[PDB]
Structure 1
Amino acid sequence: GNAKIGHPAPNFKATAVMPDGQFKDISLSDYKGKYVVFFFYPLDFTFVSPTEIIAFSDRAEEFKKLNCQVIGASVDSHFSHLAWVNTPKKQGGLGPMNIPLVSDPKRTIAQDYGVLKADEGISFRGLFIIDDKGILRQITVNDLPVGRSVDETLRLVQAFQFTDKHGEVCPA
């Protein structure tokens, strides 16, 4: 892919299902000025992914406190994303979301981020931390069966922000 630490994270423009349940075309560059956690999950209607998606959504306030936008993405269609959002949580659905979920049906965003499982046309569990200038700071990629930690993601975002100010601080 083209995701390189210290270089601008690859831009994308893609249809997402938004927290209000409607579809909107969004770009990574829309979020310049905020930190971004951009994470891929393989497919809708799966069993490791909902734990991750619901945790990032449930804890979106903690990322807001860090001026950090969270965005999920999968190769499944935005229609499929919304079907999973609208599925009752009691039956395995996501329920209402506090984060947008991007659709990557052409697989080009996953390829740009180096996380396409090429023999299977779905993304690995890639997670990318992008700073407020659009520069990639952190790459995380898990094989399909192993999920990610919101605690660890928050630790990383906060630590990048703190070290960002190392040298900018009042010298009293």
Structure 2
Amino acid sequence: GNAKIGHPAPNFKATAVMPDGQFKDISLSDYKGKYVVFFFYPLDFTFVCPTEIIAFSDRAEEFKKLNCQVIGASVDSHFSHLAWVNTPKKQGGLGPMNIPLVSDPKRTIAQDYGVLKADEGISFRGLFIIDDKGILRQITVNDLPVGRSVDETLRLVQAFQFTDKHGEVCPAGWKP
């Protein structure tokens, strides 16, 4: 991997499926001036709970209020992302999305983000917080097969922005 805290998030250009249903080649740099929640999940339909994408799609406006763009990703092609989008969510599909879904079928974005199982060719679950300047602020990687909490993720973005503005909430030990 190249992803590293305090450095620019590795930039990719990739095909995404956009909220309007269309394919568009996008880059993380497109969102400079906004915080970004970028999350990797293993595989459409078979190795992820639909609701961990749905809960972020549903609540995307809570994120846009914080000036934050949410983007999902997996090693799936854009064709497979679109198929899951066009599967109804009462059929355990995604249904229509308020957020873009990046495709990584060559596995090079997952490798670059340091979340690839090279043998299996699927990512772990990864959460990346990237600030309005494009700088990587958090990495979480795990193999925990439950959905990420939207509330917690909002709170985290809020904590980063707060401390961006105000400095340390929990002061360093040397400080008077």
TM-score of the two chains, using structure 1 as the length reference: 0.94
Distance verdict in 2 for CA 1:6–1:169, change over 3 Å: closer
The CA deviation string for residues 101-146 of structure 1, in whole angstroms up to 9 with x for no partner, is 0000110000001000122100100010000000000111120523
SS at match of 1:71: strand
CA contact (8 A) 1:42 1:144 kept: no
Deviation at 1:46, TM superposition (A): 2.8
What RMSD in Å do the two structures reach over aligned CA positions? 3.1
CA contact (8 A) 2:163 2:169 kept: no
CA contact (8 A) 2:49 2:146 kept: no
- What residue in structure 2 maps to residue 87 of structure 1? 87
- What residue in structure 2 maps to residue 108 of structure 1? 108
Deviation at 1:80, TM superposition (A): 0.5
The CA deviation string for residues 48-78 of structure 1, in whole angstroms up to 9 with x for no partner, is 4311100000000110010000000111110
Distance verdict in 2 for CA 1:126–1:171, change over 3 Å: closer
Deviation at 1:169, TM superposition (A): 14
- What residue in structure 1 maps to residue 73 of structure 2? 73
Deviation at 1:153, TM superposition (A): 0.8
SS at match of 1:158: helix
Deviation at 1:167, TM superposition (A): 5.9
Deviation at 1:147, TM superposition (A): 2.7
SS at match of 2:137: strand
Distance verdict in 2 for CA 1:76–1:166, change over 3 Å: same
Deviation at 1:92, TM superposition (A): 1.0
When structure 1 is superposed on structure 2, of 162-171 and 131-140 the one drifting more is 162-171
CA contact (8 A) 1:125 1:147 kept: no
For 1:51 and 1:37, locate their aligned partners in 2 and report how far apart those are by CA, in whole Å: 17
Gaps of 5+ in 1: none
Distance verdict in 2 for CA 1:85–1:162, change over 3 Å: same
Deviation at 1:18, TM superposition (A): 0.3
CA contact (8 A) 1:3 1:112 kept: yes
For 2:170 and 2:148, locate their aligned partners in 1 and report how far apart those are by CA, in whole Å: 36
Identity %: 99
Q: Tell me the number of residue pairs that the alignment of Structure 1 and Structure 2 aligns.
A: 172
Deviation at 1:96, TM superposition (A): 0.5
